[PDB]
């Protein structure tokens, strides 16, 4: 049930300086969307793996990772914590060890849990790898407005900063979806890149838009970026029809394709009178 | 390393078994081919003891030029309609599956593919070449429909298609096949596949600036300074390319080879 999950995510978040109620709320809202969409496809691999779709311990863990990502994003974008603290935190999460600075016990707790629950431990090292990649991508995008990046470099970094690769890997880790052997597949790698680019753009259309408008003030940036979103969605579809991926990968990917951020992140923020 | 005109005649001798083949196809193929071989020659000298493949082996060289000539010819068949839709499909099936062409007039197809299979150092490169051929073929036609769509596609789709249509993957794969450059193993790396997409994107953007990116963007977003954008993009891909090449040091002759392609000008042969 929703509020039990939100509160367990929230409770863990108190061991993270800068954590906000919204980080836990956006996480459970997005996570629930993904888990229920893939539920039926997840029941079939359920006998094989023994990983039960409604395993409370697995759900809350998946939501915590999601909250972790939203939090890190804000930390990076809003200065919620200092740059020294962000470095110690990212360093810890990237190796799966406790943070060296006080106030971030949640890093040790979550990585320890992920290690323990890993179906195929190769997913755990991959998640650590994806975590380091995410951190660097967040850094890079930030250092980019403090000349400019090209649309191509932006999108290349954006694919890593949208963290869809981390989301999929955490799902594989908890429900034994064998992403570790699937990624060796060129076409799987290619759609993962497409789905991410779709995510980065869907979000920014709520930054690529500003980046472009500054470079080419006379360019119809919004129409363009909207055509790019349509384009990627079409390429994503073509490939989806020409490749067959074991359950629940097909649904998972399409589930990520439809999830608009309006269902998460930039919609959730604590209320104030104003 | 075999004289230029003799190589041209060698290529032309085979090209004559392909309907629509023109003298210019053989010439361009030898020109581009020589440019590439000259720039990776120091490396190939180094790997030749291990592989037994001589940088100057005339059989290897002409075969490489014949494949380039095949690619130039196919582009023209597609763009200028040198052969019928039916004939192009039959040719693309033969070259893409590695079997004889089912329609007459294209004997050169089965002949070239058979030599490549036979000459392959690592036969996985031959299978990869058939795959790249299918990708190239599909991209040439899809790209063709575009200047006739009324419903042009996104820049994303254009570049993705242009990466395949520029054929650098085919060139690299054909070189690996003939000189034993172990491309099938290097592809296991994520960073190698990435530089492959990058250098191809660079080739597509360069050829177009000099289905076409400019024409596409201009008539879709007419107020956008498309040429400014594209040049930025190209410098963008170039920076990314240098990055990866620097980080991972690919075995010889891949560095010199990728470098040579980033620098090659469609004007040096076309
Ligand atoms: O498929 P498109 O017509 O879109 C294009 O990629 C062109 C092309 C036509 C014919 C052959 C090739 C290709 C094929 C074989 C060899 C070589 C090719 O490109 C180069 C460059 C340098 C050396 C050899 C080759 C590329 P373009 O960038 O010139 O439009």
Swiss-Prot record, chain A:
Entry-linked SUPFAM superfamilies: Terpenoid synthases
Organism domain of life: Bacteria
UniProt cross-references to InterPro entries, sorted A to Z: Isoprenoid_synthase_dom_sf
Pfam annotation, one family: Terpene_syn_C_2
Name of the protein in question: Uncharacterized protein blr2150
Organism the protein comes from: Bradyrhizobium diazoefficiens (strain JCM 10833 / BCRC 13528 / IAM 13628 / NBRC 14792 / USDA 110)
Higher taxonomy: Bacteria, Pseudomonadati, Pseudomonadota, Alphaproteobacteria, Hyphomicrobiales
